Design a protein around this ligand. Structure first.
Ligand SMILES: Nc1ncnc2c1ncn2[C@@H]1O[C@H](COP(=O)(O)OP(=O)(O)OP(=O)(O)O)[C@@H](O)[C@H]1O
Ligand SMILES: Nc1ncnc2c1ncn2[C@@H]1O[C@H](COP(=O)(O)OP(=O)(O)OP(=O)(O)O)[C@@H](O)[C@H]1O
Ligand SMILES: [Mg+2]
Ligand SMILES: [Mg+2]
Lengths: 346, 352
């Protein structure tokens, strides 16, 4: 009866994420239908409850990881965020792939029943992609094969709580898995298969760089692309659902500055406020900063860097000073033409 | 009492659509196994050595589907394990007799009943030696597993651990002979298709050659039907291990007519499961005849076996599944072939 409205979740996520549409929808739909699977898991001839593992392709600073924690805060079942580099197949020190389940168990108080009703977010999945075999890819291809069966759903003897200086079993049948990585190079892959011009008089000729497009190219991704990247065909299939995130936008960067609950601006304001200066900005000022981030091609992270440099001088002077009450920022300050202006009053 | 092969075959036909060859081989195996286990005493029979069968099918060919549905019909022990985690090279990790230990849980530590169990060690392509000639850093999850597993398939006593490992140093380790435990090893050999084609035509260069094309996906499911022991060794399987599995079954690829059936024919067919979920809130979900057929074409253009089917259905209804729950006053939502074409959107009746 819970039935948390798809929009409710989407809007809760909209409080922090500012711009993603496909991602918030797919997950919210997934979350909306995941409860139903467990809610109606009784024997009404609906017993297979086939799961569809989600994927999150896209570039950096797209909020791939931000969603998982915010999702965790509105999730009543167990949830954990896992890393891929740490995991390796057995026979190497690494980290055992099944260990990912143990992490979830701890958070749910080793409630096996509850544990089988949790979600996971395996970040940096693009890292384990294989090359193109000569030697065992303990961290790449190997990891995929080990995780392969887990995604489909098998039973394992997750370690039991207690150092112990009975190897309880746990089934993966109804444990949804979501893998989101910052795949680098996939844009080129899709561009090549779609159109790869070749020298010739009667052969189509196209530029190596396809209209200098990065965003919106992920929407054309297909299973073959992932296989070229290095993902094992079997693994590509294990995750039926695929999603994509645009790179960025000028409007989206101006909104992220203030709109999000825990925006970067608030942190600086809070800090400056405790220093005794009223941190302030301007509308055009905020827009100017966004332009800089787009040139850095670093994503949302870029924003932070720009702010610090402009405010480095002020963050070094203001503390010693005990007069300034308000510090405003103008487009001229972002441009650098002027120096950070202050109001020596109080 | 032993059910006739045909019976088992038809039971599994209810879910599997097109694995006639595989369904027949397994049927004989279960049928002859029961007989052996039911006539295992001293009546003109000395050892009646078990015949271990192998399975090789493309992705999403139902290899996994068969074993669970098979398990539900079996009256003897049955366990599903994986070779990927097993890394027996006498260095670290699980051992090979722990796979039968899972079987003992089904048997409740019944030593005799364990000898009547069945095995499903799949994913035998993950242990295939990279080159078959170890040169540096002797494999841990490769050659080792093959060598270690060799003994069990041939048969040998097994020191399976008991329920716990703290009461006593030994806790009366159960002793279960393996010779009488039929092994059914089914793995998806990704790459065998090219290996077999190397033996079909040894494409050289010249007028009098047998030059082969660089793609063989059209005949990927047919490649398995031409498999031979020599091809398995090239892929990296120890020749000894190949011999321990005399029979080599094969699974074919899929068809546009077999995908349409799987969409609705099975008990928990994808379409049924989609409608089932859609029906919990109370909105009826229906699809036209041509609507379902459209999904089959897309499935064959993804080379993602039956799994691709599910994926396609997700994309077809994403925006509506987001709206439908909150969008009350929707008697039913019919689907058409246009919806799969991408021209029209889900037909929302939006009426009492
Ligand atoms: N849509 C967005 N709205 C607001 N902030 C965002 C958005 N996308 C990213 N961010 C910011 O980016 C930071 C998190 O970056 P994130 O972890 O999503 O990168 P990533 O895509 O996971 O990179 P990688 O995949 O390499 O880890 C947060 O501080 C967050 O404020
Ligand atoms: N012949 C078939 N008939 C009906 N359903 C099928 C068939 N083949 C595959 N499926 C469906 O595909 C899903 C997953 O397929 P499955 O895991 O059996 O493929 P697989 O052979 O194990 O692939 P891999 O060996 O690479 O893991 C199952 O839930 C099943 O319903
Ligand atoms: Mg991240
Ligand atoms: Mg399989």
């Amino acid at each position: 009866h819970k039935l948390p409205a798809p929009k409710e979740i989407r809007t809760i996520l909209d409080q922090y994420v500012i711009g993603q549409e496909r991602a918030k929808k797919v997950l919210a739909v997934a979350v909306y239908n995941h409860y139903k699977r467990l809610n109606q898991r009784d024997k009404k001839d609906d017993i297979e409850l086939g799961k569809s593992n989600i994927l999150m392709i896209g570039p950096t600073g797209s909020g791939k990881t931000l969603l998982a924690e915010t999702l965790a805060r509105l999730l009543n079942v167990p949830f954990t965020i896992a890393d891929a580099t740490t995991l390796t197949e057995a026979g190497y020190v690494g980290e055992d792939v099944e260990n990912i389940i143990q992490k979830l168990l701890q958070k749910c108080d080793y409630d096996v029943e509850k544990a089988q009703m949790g979600i996971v977010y395996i970040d940096e999945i693009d890292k384990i992609s294989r090359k193109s075999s000569i030697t065992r890819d303990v961290s790449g291809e190997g990891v995929q094969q080990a995780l392969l069966k887990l995604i489909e759903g098998t039973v394992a003897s997750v370690p039991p709580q207690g150092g112990r200086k009975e190897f309880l079993q746990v089934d993966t049948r109804n444990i949804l898995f979501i893998c989101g990585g910052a795949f680098a190079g996939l844009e080129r892959v899709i561009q090549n298969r779609s159109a790869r011009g070749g020298i010739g008089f009667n052969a189509e000729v196209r530029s190596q760089e396809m209209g200098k497009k990065v965003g919106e190219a992920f929407k054309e991704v297909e299973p073959e692309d992932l296989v070229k990247f290095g993902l094992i065909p079997e693994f590509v299939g294990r995750l039926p659902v695929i999603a994509t995130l645009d790179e960025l936008d000028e409007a989206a960067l101006m909104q992220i500055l203030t709109e999000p609950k825990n925006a970067l601006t608030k942190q600086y304001a809070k800090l400056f406020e405790m220093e005794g200066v009223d941190l302030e900005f301007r509308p055009d000022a905020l827009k100017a900063v966004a332009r800089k981030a787009l040139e850095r091609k670093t994503g949302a992270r870029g924003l932070r860097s720009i702010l610090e440099g402009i405010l480095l001088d002020t963050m070094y002077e203001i503390p010693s000073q005990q007069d300034v009450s308000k510090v405003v920022i103008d487009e001229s300050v972002i441009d650098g033409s002027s120096q950070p202006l202050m109001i020596y009053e109080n």
